Write a protein that binds this ligand. Structure first.
Ligand SMILES: [Zn+2]
Ligand SMILES: [Zn+2]
Length: 485
Protein backbone atom coordinates (compact mmCIF):
# COMPACT_ATOMS: atom_id res chain seq x y z
CA UNK A 1 0.00 0.00 0.00
CA UNK A 2 1.38 3.44 -0.88
CA UNK A 3 4.18 4.46 -3.26
CA UNK A 4 7.98 4.08 -2.85
CA UNK A 5 10.82 5.05 -5.11
CA UNK A 6 14.13 3.38 -4.29
CA UNK A 7 16.59 5.74 -5.87
CA UNK A 8 20.33 5.80 -6.63
CA UNK A 9 21.07 2.11 -5.90
CA UNK A 10 22.48 -0.75 -7.96
CA UNK A 11 19.89 -3.47 -8.62
CA UNK A 12 21.32 -7.00 -8.22
CA UNK A 13 19.40 -9.87 -9.76
CA UNK A 14 20.63 -13.44 -10.25
CA UNK A 15 21.71 -12.73 -13.80
CA UNK A 16 23.30 -9.24 -13.55
CA UNK A 17 23.67 -6.00 -11.63
CA UNK A 18 22.87 -2.55 -13.01
CA UNK A 19 22.14 0.95 -11.74
CA UNK A 20 18.45 1.82 -11.84
CA UNK A 21 15.71 3.16 -9.64
CA UNK A 22 12.86 0.95 -8.54
CA UNK A 23 9.27 2.28 -8.37
CA UNK A 24 7.00 0.39 -6.00
CA UNK A 25 3.21 0.92 -6.01
CA UNK A 26 0.55 -1.16 -4.36
CA UNK A 27 2.73 -4.03 -3.21
CA UNK A 28 4.40 -4.50 -6.62
CA UNK A 29 7.44 -3.31 -8.48
CA UNK A 30 5.87 -1.26 -11.26
CA UNK A 31 8.96 0.13 -12.92
CA UNK A 32 12.73 -0.39 -12.97
CA UNK A 33 14.90 2.08 -14.85
CA UNK A 34 17.34 4.97 -14.49
CA UNK A 35 16.33 8.37 -13.08
CA UNK A 36 12.70 7.68 -12.36
CA UNK A 37 10.35 10.53 -11.49
CA UNK A 38 9.18 10.71 -7.90
CA UNK A 39 5.35 10.82 -8.04
CA UNK A 40 3.79 13.32 -5.62
CA UNK A 41 3.38 11.66 -2.23
CA UNK A 42 5.81 8.76 -2.90
CA UNK A 43 8.42 8.06 -0.29
CA UNK A 44 12.03 8.01 -1.61
CA UNK A 45 14.45 5.45 -0.12
CA UNK A 46 17.94 6.69 -0.94
CA UNK A 47 19.83 3.58 -2.04
CA UNK A 48 23.02 5.53 -3.01
CA UNK A 49 25.98 3.25 -2.34
CA UNK A 50 23.68 0.33 -1.66
CA UNK A 51 22.60 -2.77 -3.55
CA UNK A 52 18.89 -3.23 -4.22
CA UNK A 53 18.22 -6.95 -4.02
CA UNK A 54 15.24 -9.28 -3.82
CA UNK A 55 14.37 -9.91 -0.16
CA UNK A 56 15.83 -13.22 1.17
CA UNK A 57 13.64 -16.35 0.94
CA UNK A 58 14.31 -18.72 3.76
CA UNK A 59 13.38 -22.13 2.42
CA UNK A 60 13.54 -23.89 5.82
CA UNK A 61 11.97 -22.76 9.08
CA UNK A 62 10.14 -24.36 12.00
CA UNK A 63 8.56 -21.34 13.76
CA UNK A 64 6.91 -22.32 17.13
CA UNK A 65 7.27 -25.99 16.34
CA UNK A 66 6.24 -28.33 19.19
CA UNK A 67 9.13 -30.81 19.15
CA UNK A 68 11.02 -32.99 21.63
CA UNK A 69 8.73 -32.20 24.61
CA UNK A 70 8.70 -28.36 24.20
CA UNK A 71 8.00 -25.54 21.68
CA UNK A 72 10.43 -23.48 19.60
CA UNK A 73 10.70 -19.98 21.10
CA UNK A 74 10.83 -18.09 17.83
CA UNK A 75 7.16 -18.09 16.77
CA UNK A 76 5.52 -16.96 13.51
CA UNK A 77 5.34 -13.42 14.78
CA UNK A 78 8.80 -12.87 16.33
CA UNK A 79 10.42 -15.21 13.79
CA UNK A 80 9.16 -13.25 10.79
CA UNK A 81 10.04 -9.90 12.44
CA UNK A 82 13.58 -11.24 12.97
CA UNK A 83 13.67 -12.44 9.35
CA UNK A 84 12.78 -8.96 8.17
CA UNK A 85 15.38 -7.27 10.36
CA UNK A 86 17.90 -9.65 8.69
CA UNK A 87 16.86 -8.86 5.09
CA UNK A 88 14.65 -11.99 4.71
CA UNK A 89 11.13 -11.29 3.35
CA UNK A 90 9.68 -14.79 3.03
CA UNK A 91 9.95 -17.98 5.02
CA UNK A 92 8.85 -21.46 4.04
CA UNK A 93 7.88 -23.47 7.08
CA UNK A 94 7.25 -27.20 7.57
CA UNK A 95 3.83 -28.50 8.52
CA UNK A 96 5.17 -31.27 10.80
CA UNK A 97 2.35 -33.79 10.37
CA UNK A 98 2.24 -36.35 13.15
CA UNK A 99 2.28 -39.99 12.32
CA UNK A 100 -1.35 -41.12 11.60
CA UNK A 101 -2.54 -37.46 11.57
CA UNK A 102 -4.44 -35.98 8.57
CA UNK A 103 -2.10 -33.89 6.39
CA UNK A 104 -5.01 -31.52 5.76
CA UNK A 105 -5.59 -31.02 9.49
CA UNK A 106 -1.98 -30.33 10.13
CA UNK A 107 -1.92 -27.93 7.11
CA UNK A 108 -5.06 -26.18 8.47
CA UNK A 109 -3.54 -25.98 11.92
CA UNK A 110 -0.35 -24.29 10.53
CA UNK A 111 -2.34 -21.81 8.38
CA UNK A 112 -4.53 -20.80 11.42
CA UNK A 113 -1.45 -20.37 13.59
CA UNK A 114 0.63 -18.49 11.02
CA UNK A 115 -1.90 -16.44 9.07
CA UNK A 116 -2.67 -13.90 11.89
CA UNK A 117 0.96 -13.77 13.11
CA UNK A 118 3.30 -13.58 10.10
CA UNK A 119 4.91 -10.19 9.42
CA UNK A 120 6.28 -11.22 6.02
CA UNK A 121 5.01 -13.51 3.26
CA UNK A 122 5.34 -17.24 3.74
CA UNK A 123 4.40 -20.61 2.43
CA UNK A 124 4.44 -24.16 3.65
CA UNK A 125 5.97 -27.49 2.94
CA UNK A 126 3.99 -30.52 4.27
CA UNK A 127 5.74 -33.46 6.00
CA UNK A 128 4.57 -36.89 4.94
CA UNK A 129 5.32 -38.84 8.09
CA UNK A 130 3.28 -41.92 7.33
CA UNK A 131 1.73 -43.51 4.28
CA UNK A 132 -1.72 -44.73 3.30
CA UNK A 133 -4.52 -44.14 0.75
CA UNK A 134 -5.66 -41.15 2.84
CA UNK A 135 -2.19 -39.55 2.86
CA UNK A 136 -2.06 -40.22 -0.89
CA UNK A 137 -5.32 -38.36 -1.44
CA UNK A 138 -4.45 -35.53 0.87
CA UNK A 139 -1.14 -34.92 -0.89
CA UNK A 140 -3.06 -34.47 -4.17
CA UNK A 141 -5.46 -32.04 -2.55
CA UNK A 142 -2.61 -30.09 -0.98
CA UNK A 143 -0.72 -29.88 -4.30
CA UNK A 144 -3.78 -28.98 -6.41
CA UNK A 145 -5.84 -26.82 -4.02
CA UNK A 146 -3.77 -25.74 -1.01
CA UNK A 147 -0.82 -24.07 -2.64
CA UNK A 148 1.83 -26.66 -1.56
CA UNK A 149 4.16 -28.34 -4.06
CA UNK A 150 6.78 -29.61 -1.57
CA UNK A 151 6.45 -32.64 0.67
CA UNK A 152 9.03 -33.53 3.34
CA UNK A 153 10.05 -37.03 4.20
CA UNK A 154 12.33 -38.25 6.94
CA UNK A 155 14.83 -41.08 6.81
CA UNK A 156 15.73 -40.46 10.52
CA UNK A 157 13.46 -40.13 13.70
CA UNK A 158 12.71 -43.84 13.94
CA UNK A 159 9.30 -44.35 15.55
CA UNK A 160 8.40 -40.70 15.08
CA UNK A 161 8.69 -39.50 11.38
CA UNK A 162 10.81 -42.16 9.70
CA UNK A 163 9.81 -43.87 6.50
CA UNK A 164 11.46 -47.06 5.13
CA UNK A 165 12.78 -47.43 1.58
CA UNK A 166 9.66 -49.11 0.26
CA UNK A 167 7.54 -46.28 1.71
CA UNK A 168 9.90 -43.60 0.34
CA UNK A 169 9.61 -45.25 -3.06
CA UNK A 170 5.78 -45.04 -2.94
CA UNK A 171 5.80 -41.50 -1.50
CA UNK A 172 8.35 -40.24 -4.03
CA UNK A 173 6.41 -41.90 -6.88
CA UNK A 174 3.29 -40.03 -5.70
CA UNK A 175 5.17 -36.69 -5.38
CA UNK A 176 6.11 -37.06 -9.02
CA UNK A 177 2.50 -37.90 -9.94
CA UNK A 178 1.20 -34.74 -8.24
CA UNK A 179 3.96 -32.43 -9.57
CA UNK A 180 5.52 -31.92 -6.11
CA UNK A 181 9.18 -31.89 -5.16
CA UNK A 182 10.27 -34.51 -2.61
CA UNK A 183 12.22 -33.01 0.23
CA UNK A 184 14.20 -35.40 2.46
CA UNK A 185 15.83 -35.25 5.87
CA UNK A 186 18.66 -37.61 4.94
CA UNK A 187 20.26 -39.46 7.89
CA UNK A 188 20.03 -43.17 8.51
CA UNK A 189 17.56 -43.34 11.42
CA UNK A 190 18.64 -46.94 12.42
CA UNK A 191 22.23 -45.80 12.83
CA UNK A 192 21.20 -42.74 14.77
CA UNK A 193 19.11 -44.86 17.09
CA UNK A 194 21.92 -47.42 17.71
CA UNK A 195 24.60 -44.84 17.86
CA UNK A 196 22.84 -42.73 20.53
CA UNK A 197 22.21 -45.84 22.64
CA UNK A 198 25.92 -46.66 22.38
CA UNK A 199 27.19 -43.21 23.25
CA UNK A 200 24.89 -43.02 26.34
CA UNK A 201 26.09 -46.49 27.47
CA UNK A 202 29.66 -45.17 27.21
CA UNK A 203 28.86 -42.24 29.51
CA UNK A 204 29.14 -39.72 26.67
CA UNK A 205 25.97 -37.80 27.59
CA UNK A 206 27.22 -34.38 26.46
CA UNK A 207 26.64 -32.70 23.06
CA UNK A 208 29.81 -34.35 21.68
CA UNK A 209 27.83 -37.56 22.02
CA UNK A 210 25.18 -36.07 19.72
CA UNK A 211 27.63 -35.58 16.83
CA UNK A 212 29.60 -38.82 17.54
CA UNK A 213 26.47 -40.97 17.39
CA UNK A 214 25.66 -39.77 13.84
CA UNK A 215 28.89 -38.66 12.13
CA UNK A 216 28.77 -37.45 8.51
CA UNK A 217 28.83 -40.96 6.99
CA UNK A 218 25.37 -41.44 8.45
CA UNK A 219 24.08 -38.34 6.57
CA UNK A 220 26.07 -39.22 3.37
CA UNK A 221 24.65 -42.69 3.25
CA UNK A 222 20.98 -41.63 3.58
CA UNK A 223 21.56 -38.79 1.09
CA UNK A 224 22.82 -41.24 -1.57
CA UNK A 225 20.06 -43.65 -0.77
CA UNK A 226 17.33 -40.97 -1.23
CA UNK A 227 18.89 -39.85 -4.52
CA UNK A 228 18.89 -43.47 -5.71
CA UNK A 229 15.27 -44.12 -4.78
CA UNK A 230 14.17 -40.78 -6.33
CA UNK A 231 16.17 -41.53 -9.47
CA UNK A 232 14.49 -44.91 -9.70
CA UNK A 233 11.01 -43.28 -9.92
CA UNK A 234 12.16 -40.13 -11.79
CA UNK A 235 11.00 -37.94 -8.88
CA UNK A 236 12.81 -34.58 -8.34
CA UNK A 237 14.50 -34.53 -4.94
CA UNK A 238 15.49 -31.82 -2.54
CA UNK A 239 17.94 -32.60 0.24
CA UNK A 240 17.29 -30.22 3.14
CA UNK A 241 20.02 -28.98 5.58
CA UNK A 242 23.11 -30.40 4.01
CA UNK A 243 25.51 -30.33 6.96
CA UNK A 244 28.65 -32.12 5.82
CA UNK A 245 31.25 -32.26 3.10
CA UNK A 246 30.52 -35.93 2.33
CA UNK A 247 26.72 -35.46 1.99
CA UNK A 248 27.30 -32.35 -0.12
CA UNK A 249 29.72 -34.36 -2.35
CA UNK A 250 26.94 -36.97 -2.76
CA UNK A 251 24.57 -34.28 -4.06
CA UNK A 252 27.40 -32.78 -6.18
CA UNK A 253 28.09 -36.14 -7.83
CA UNK A 254 24.43 -36.94 -8.47
CA UNK A 255 23.84 -33.58 -10.18
CA UNK A 256 26.96 -34.00 -12.36
CA UNK A 257 25.50 -37.40 -13.25
CA UNK A 258 22.31 -35.53 -14.31
CA UNK A 259 20.05 -36.57 -11.36
CA UNK A 260 17.33 -34.00 -10.65
CA UNK A 261 18.37 -33.21 -7.06
CA UNK A 262 18.89 -29.97 -5.18
CA UNK A 263 20.96 -29.53 -2.04
CA UNK A 264 20.20 -26.91 0.61
CA UNK A 265 23.00 -26.04 3.06
CA UNK A 266 21.75 -23.79 5.92
CA UNK A 267 23.19 -20.69 7.56
CA UNK A 268 24.44 -22.83 10.46
CA UNK A 269 26.44 -25.19 8.22
CA UNK A 270 27.78 -22.26 6.19
CA UNK A 271 28.69 -20.04 9.11
CA UNK A 272 29.93 -22.27 11.93
CA UNK A 273 30.99 -25.83 12.67
CA UNK A 274 30.61 -28.72 15.08
CA UNK A 275 33.83 -28.19 17.07
CA UNK A 276 31.43 -26.29 19.38
CA UNK A 277 29.94 -29.59 20.63
CA UNK A 278 33.26 -30.27 22.33
CA UNK A 279 33.30 -26.91 24.20
CA UNK A 280 34.00 -27.21 27.94
CA UNK A 281 30.87 -25.13 28.66
CA UNK A 282 27.88 -27.48 28.38
CA UNK A 283 25.40 -24.68 27.69
CA UNK A 284 27.50 -23.32 24.83
CA UNK A 285 27.90 -26.78 23.28
CA UNK A 286 24.17 -27.51 23.57
CA UNK A 287 23.30 -24.34 21.67
CA UNK A 288 24.56 -25.95 18.42
CA UNK A 289 22.73 -29.23 18.80
CA UNK A 290 20.46 -29.97 15.76
CA UNK A 291 19.92 -32.92 13.44
CA UNK A 292 21.88 -33.55 11.43
CA UNK A 293 24.69 -32.14 13.53
CA UNK A 294 27.25 -29.51 12.54
CA UNK A 295 30.57 -31.20 11.75
CA UNK A 296 33.84 -31.09 13.73
CA UNK A 297 35.95 -30.77 10.53
CA UNK A 298 36.56 -27.01 10.49
CA UNK A 299 36.97 -27.04 6.69
CA UNK A 300 33.24 -27.87 6.42
CA UNK A 301 31.53 -24.47 6.21
CA UNK A 302 34.02 -23.08 3.69
CA UNK A 303 33.69 -26.21 1.55
CA UNK A 304 29.91 -26.01 1.65
CA UNK A 305 30.18 -22.36 0.68
CA UNK A 306 32.47 -23.28 -2.29
CA UNK A 307 29.91 -25.90 -3.45
CA UNK A 308 27.11 -23.33 -3.02
CA UNK A 309 29.12 -20.90 -5.12
CA UNK A 310 29.62 -23.59 -7.78
CA UNK A 311 25.96 -24.72 -7.75
CA UNK A 312 26.76 -28.24 -6.47
CA UNK A 313 24.51 -26.82 -3.77
CA UNK A 314 21.81 -24.50 -5.03
CA UNK A 315 20.02 -22.47 -2.30
CA UNK A 316 19.81 -21.79 1.42
CA UNK A 317 17.53 -21.83 4.40
CA UNK A 318 18.28 -21.74 8.13
CA UNK A 319 16.31 -24.61 9.65
CA UNK A 320 15.41 -22.02 12.27
CA UNK A 321 14.02 -24.03 15.22
CA UNK A 322 15.00 -22.19 18.35
CA UNK A 323 15.11 -23.26 21.98
CA UNK A 324 16.14 -21.03 24.82
CA UNK A 325 19.00 -21.82 27.17
CA UNK A 326 16.60 -23.22 29.80
CA UNK A 327 14.91 -25.37 27.12
CA UNK A 328 18.18 -26.78 25.87
CA UNK A 329 19.03 -27.48 29.55
CA UNK A 330 16.37 -30.23 29.47
CA UNK A 331 19.13 -32.54 28.13
CA UNK A 332 21.90 -31.59 30.62
CA UNK A 333 22.24 -35.24 31.62
CA UNK A 334 21.44 -36.80 28.23
CA UNK A 335 22.03 -35.31 24.76
CA UNK A 336 19.09 -37.23 23.31
CA UNK A 337 16.87 -34.88 25.32
CA UNK A 338 18.42 -31.60 24.19
CA UNK A 339 15.74 -30.08 21.93
CA UNK A 340 17.34 -30.03 18.46
CA UNK A 341 17.53 -26.75 16.60
CA UNK A 342 19.58 -23.64 16.08
CA UNK A 343 18.89 -20.06 15.05
CA UNK A 344 19.66 -18.40 11.68
CA UNK A 345 16.52 -16.81 10.18
CA UNK A 346 17.71 -13.31 11.01
CA UNK A 347 21.42 -13.75 10.29
CA UNK A 348 21.36 -15.91 7.16
CA UNK A 349 21.75 -12.99 4.69
CA UNK A 350 24.74 -11.36 6.48
CA UNK A 351 26.36 -14.71 7.28
CA UNK A 352 26.25 -15.79 3.64
CA UNK A 353 27.36 -12.40 2.34
CA UNK A 354 30.35 -12.35 4.73
CA UNK A 355 31.34 -16.01 4.25
CA UNK A 356 30.42 -16.19 0.51
CA UNK A 357 30.69 -12.78 -1.20
CA UNK A 358 33.16 -10.79 0.89
CA UNK A 359 35.38 -13.92 0.94
CA UNK A 360 35.53 -13.98 -2.84
CA UNK A 361 33.82 -17.38 -3.16
CA UNK A 362 30.71 -16.17 -5.03
CA UNK A 363 29.65 -12.87 -6.60
CA UNK A 364 26.64 -10.70 -5.60
CA UNK A 365 24.50 -12.19 -8.32
CA UNK A 366 25.08 -15.80 -7.18
CA UNK A 367 24.27 -14.47 -3.70
CA UNK A 368 20.81 -13.40 -4.88
CA UNK A 369 20.34 -16.77 -6.59
CA UNK A 370 21.16 -18.79 -3.47
CA UNK A 371 19.27 -16.55 -1.05
CA UNK A 372 16.06 -15.91 -3.03
CA UNK A 373 15.79 -16.67 -6.75
CA UNK A 374 16.42 -20.39 -6.62
CA UNK A 375 13.87 -20.87 -3.81
CA UNK A 376 11.35 -19.02 -5.93
CA UNK A 377 12.19 -21.14 -8.95
CA UNK A 378 12.03 -24.49 -7.12
CA UNK A 379 8.94 -23.76 -5.01
CA UNK A 380 7.25 -22.11 -8.06
CA UNK A 381 6.84 -18.32 -7.69
CA UNK A 382 9.59 -16.84 -9.78
CA UNK A 383 9.81 -14.12 -10.89
CA UNK A 384 6.93 -13.07 -8.60
CA UNK A 385 9.63 -13.18 -5.91
CA UNK A 386 13.45 -13.40 -6.18
CA UNK A 387 13.80 -10.75 -8.89
CA UNK A 388 13.83 -6.96 -9.03
CA UNK A 389 11.68 -6.51 -12.10
CA UNK A 390 8.40 -4.91 -13.18
CA UNK A 391 5.37 -6.83 -11.98
CA UNK A 392 7.29 -8.70 -9.31
CA UNK A 393 6.27 -8.47 -5.65
CA UNK A 394 7.91 -5.53 -3.82
CA UNK A 395 9.91 -7.62 -1.33
CA UNK A 396 13.16 -5.68 -1.61
CA UNK A 397 16.16 -5.17 0.59
CA UNK A 398 18.55 -2.21 0.47
CA UNK A 399 21.85 -3.80 1.26
CA UNK A 400 25.12 -2.23 2.38
CA UNK A 401 27.86 -4.65 1.27
CA UNK A 402 30.80 -2.62 2.73
CA UNK A 403 29.62 -1.99 6.28
CA UNK A 404 29.97 -4.67 8.92
CA UNK A 405 27.67 -5.57 11.78
CA UNK A 406 28.58 -7.82 14.69
CA UNK A 407 26.08 -10.57 15.29
CA UNK A 408 25.05 -10.91 18.90
CA UNK A 409 22.15 -12.27 20.91
CA UNK A 410 22.40 -8.91 22.75
CA UNK A 411 21.25 -7.10 19.63
CA UNK A 412 19.36 -9.71 17.55
CA UNK A 413 15.60 -9.79 17.13
CA UNK A 414 15.09 -13.47 17.63
CA UNK A 415 13.36 -14.78 20.74
CA UNK A 416 16.23 -17.15 21.51
CA UNK A 417 18.65 -15.91 24.22
CA UNK A 418 21.85 -16.91 22.40
CA UNK A 419 23.13 -16.95 18.80
CA UNK A 420 25.36 -19.63 17.16
CA UNK A 421 27.05 -16.84 15.24
CA UNK A 422 27.73 -14.83 18.44
CA UNK A 423 30.48 -12.26 17.77
CA UNK A 424 30.74 -12.81 14.04
CA UNK A 425 31.67 -9.63 12.23
CA UNK A 426 29.78 -9.74 8.93
CA UNK A 427 30.15 -7.46 5.96
CA UNK A 428 26.71 -6.92 4.40
CA UNK A 429 23.95 -5.20 6.35
CA UNK A 430 20.25 -4.95 5.50
CA UNK A 431 19.68 -1.25 5.98
CA UNK A 432 16.08 -1.13 4.74
CA UNK A 433 13.62 -3.94 4.25
CA UNK A 434 10.46 -3.58 2.09
CA UNK A 435 7.88 -6.34 2.31
CA UNK A 436 4.62 -6.26 0.26
CA UNK A 437 5.52 -2.74 -0.86
CA UNK A 438 5.84 -1.31 2.68
CA UNK A 439 8.96 -0.28 4.56
CA UNK A 440 8.95 -2.76 7.43
CA UNK A 441 12.52 -2.26 8.70
CA UNK A 442 14.75 0.80 8.67
CA UNK A 443 17.11 2.74 10.94
CA UNK A 444 17.46 -0.45 12.96
CA UNK A 445 13.75 -0.46 13.77
CA UNK A 446 10.90 -2.75 12.73
CA UNK A 447 7.58 -1.28 11.63
CA UNK A 448 5.24 -4.16 10.98
CA UNK A 449 2.15 -5.87 12.36
CA UNK A 450 1.48 -9.55 12.98
CA UNK A 451 -0.67 -10.86 10.12
CA UNK A 452 0.58 -8.27 7.65
CA UNK A 453 2.27 -11.11 5.68
CA UNK A 454 0.42 -13.45 3.33
CA UNK A 455 0.43 -17.15 2.60
CA UNK A 456 1.77 -17.72 -0.93
CA UNK A 457 -0.26 -20.36 -2.84
CA UNK A 458 1.88 -22.25 -5.37
CA UNK A 459 0.99 -24.43 -8.31
CA UNK A 460 2.58 -27.89 -8.90
CA UNK A 461 4.91 -28.83 -11.69
CA UNK A 462 7.37 -26.08 -11.15
CA UNK A 463 9.08 -25.83 -14.56
CA UNK A 464 12.54 -25.38 -13.07
CA UNK A 465 12.00 -28.65 -11.30
CA UNK A 466 9.99 -30.67 -13.87
CA UNK A 467 10.89 -29.79 -17.46
CA UNK A 468 13.70 -32.31 -17.53
CA UNK A 469 11.66 -34.91 -15.53
CA UNK A 470 8.88 -34.67 -18.11
CA UNK A 471 11.22 -34.97 -21.07
CA UNK A 472 12.80 -38.06 -19.52
CA UNK A 473 9.28 -39.56 -19.12
CA UNK A 474 8.89 -39.05 -22.88
CA UNK A 475 12.27 -40.39 -24.14
CA UNK A 476 13.65 -42.40 -21.18
CA UNK A 477 10.97 -45.15 -20.98
CA UNK A 478 12.68 -48.57 -20.83
CA UNK A 479 11.93 -50.68 -23.89
CA UNK A 480 11.43 -54.41 -24.39
CA UNK A 481 13.82 -56.22 -26.72
CA UNK A 482 11.86 -57.62 -29.70
CA UNK A 483 12.43 -61.33 -29.86
CA UNK A 484 11.11 -64.08 -32.10
CA UNK A 485 8.10 -65.42 -30.16
ZN1 LIG B 1 15.59 -32.16 9.32
ZN1 LIG C 1 14.18 -28.70 9.45
Amino acid sequence: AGEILIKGGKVVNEDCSFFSDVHIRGGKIVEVGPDLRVPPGARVIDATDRLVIPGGIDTHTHMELAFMGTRAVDDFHIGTKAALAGGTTMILDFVMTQKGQSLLEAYDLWRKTADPKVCCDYSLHVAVTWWSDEVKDEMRTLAQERGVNSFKMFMAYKGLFMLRDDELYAVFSHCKEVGAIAQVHAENGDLIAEGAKKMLSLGITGPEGHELCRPEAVEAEATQRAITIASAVNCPLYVVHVMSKSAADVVSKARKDGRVVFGEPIAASLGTDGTNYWHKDWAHAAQYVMGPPLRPDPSTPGYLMDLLANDDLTLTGTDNCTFSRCQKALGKDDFTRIPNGVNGVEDRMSVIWEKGVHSGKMDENRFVAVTSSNAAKIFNFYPQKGRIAKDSDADVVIWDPKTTRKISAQTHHQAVDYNIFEGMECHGVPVVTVSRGRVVYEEGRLKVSPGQGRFIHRQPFSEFVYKRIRQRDEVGKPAVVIREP
